[PDB]
């Protein structure tokens, strides 16, 4: 599926909410997202705040000391995949000292492609025992989910349908214990049939195409994926980038011209985190590896005869 | 009379206050493994 918004770079949002609106048009964050150290924020600051366009983060999501934030369900309602290309100490998701967080509420999060979860020291945090992480990560043995309100027997996590004597949510088994899975009082955890494997399924439970990841609008169609297992190319999920495209940032196919435009934007002002991009082994990358120098006329890494300049 | 983990954050929050923290070895080495003075610690505040 062709993304409605932009591909934004990695961000680090601190102190006040002003800079957070820089995310308003992102579909994909190509980097990490850190939101931290907001000491004077209150719940009223988050009552009217939402980023429904965000579907995917290529690296990691880190939330630390954000006061007044009680749930993420309105902030990141559609975040489906955290690829974990780069991680924070082996974690793709970090929720630490979030003093007011009552629930995660990331009800669309289907897959964490690489890395683990660290949810630690969140004194009001519940709706943790209700999440089956085995449906989201392969490596759940490296999860570190401790020192939350959830540790004791004061949460009482109540899932959709309970009041009506119903079990609206799918129930799964984690080491001999059978339990109904949900994110909040009003959102179930989506669980797909076993036949779907990691590909996801539509709202009706029909398997997505093998090139999808987590969710799709229509079954068995690689142009109808919410996110891709391997690479993305002009609203289509593909196993590898075909020629004349190059593999970029481990998730998308780009053309020579794109790689070239990046290279020639990074001319003057070496600041703000820029590299002169190069082509090496069908990838568009920040710099040539050691032992190679960049042939100037075609951005192509060539090995150096003797030491590199 | 060193500062670690929670105590360190609380101290930075008090010292920095409204200014916030700056961005773009570290503090643990300077202030937790070793003792640091207020002039070192305040260098972590935004302008």
């Amino acid at each position: 599926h062709l993304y409605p918004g932009e591909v934004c770079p990695g961000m680090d949002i601190r102190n006040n909410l002003t800079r957070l609106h820089e995310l308003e048009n992102c579909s994909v964050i190509e980097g990490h997202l850190q939101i931290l150290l907001m000491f004077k924020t209150r719940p009223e600051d988050f009552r009217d705040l939402s980023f429904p366009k965000l579907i995917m983060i290529t690296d990691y999501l880190l939330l630390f000391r954000v006061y007044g934030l009680e749930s993420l369900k309105d902030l990141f309602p559609n975040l489906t995949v955290i690829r974990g290309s780069r991680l924070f100490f082996n974690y793709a998701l970090v929720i630490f000292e979030m003093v007011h967080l009552k629930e995660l509420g990331l009800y669309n999060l289907m897959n964490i492609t690489r890395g683990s979860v660290r949810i630690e020291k969140n004194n009001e945090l519940c709706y943790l025992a209700t999440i089956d992480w085995s449906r989201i990560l392969d490596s759940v043995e490296d999860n570190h989910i401790v020192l939350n309100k959830d540790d004791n027997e004061e949460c009482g996590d109540i899932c959709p349908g309970t009041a009506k004597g119903k079990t609206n949510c799918p129930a799964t088994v984690i080491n001999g214990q059978f339990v109904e899975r949900c994110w909040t009082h009003s959102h179930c955890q989506k669980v797909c049939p076993t036949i779907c494997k990691s590909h996801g399924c539509t709202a009706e439970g029909l398997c997505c195409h093998s090139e999808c990841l987590g969710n799709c609008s229509q079954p068995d169609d690689p142009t109808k994926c919410v996110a891709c297992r391997n690479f993305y190319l002009d609203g289509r999920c593909v196993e590898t980038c075909p020629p004349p495209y190059y593999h970029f940032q481990d998730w998308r196919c780009v053309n020579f011209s794109f790689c070239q435009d990046l290279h020639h934007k990074c001319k003057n002002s070496r600041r703000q985190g820029c590299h002169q991009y190069v082509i090496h082994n069908n990838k568009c990358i920040p710099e040539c590896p050691s032992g190679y120098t960049m042939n100037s006329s075609n951005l192509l890494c060539t090995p150096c005869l003797g030491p590199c300049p | 009379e060193t500062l670690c983990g929670a105590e360190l954050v609380d101290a930075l929050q008090f010292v920095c206050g409204d200014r916030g923290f700056y961005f773009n070895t570290g503090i643990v080495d300077e202030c937790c493994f070793r003792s640091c003075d207020l002039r070192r610690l305040e260098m972590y505040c935004a302008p």
Binding site: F88 | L8, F21, G26, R40
Partner: peptide
């Protein structure tokens, strides 16, 4: 945690 503080807290 110390790895967290080192990464997030930067002077300059």
């Amino acid at each position: 945690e110390n790895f967290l503080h080192n990464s997030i807290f930067v002077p300059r």
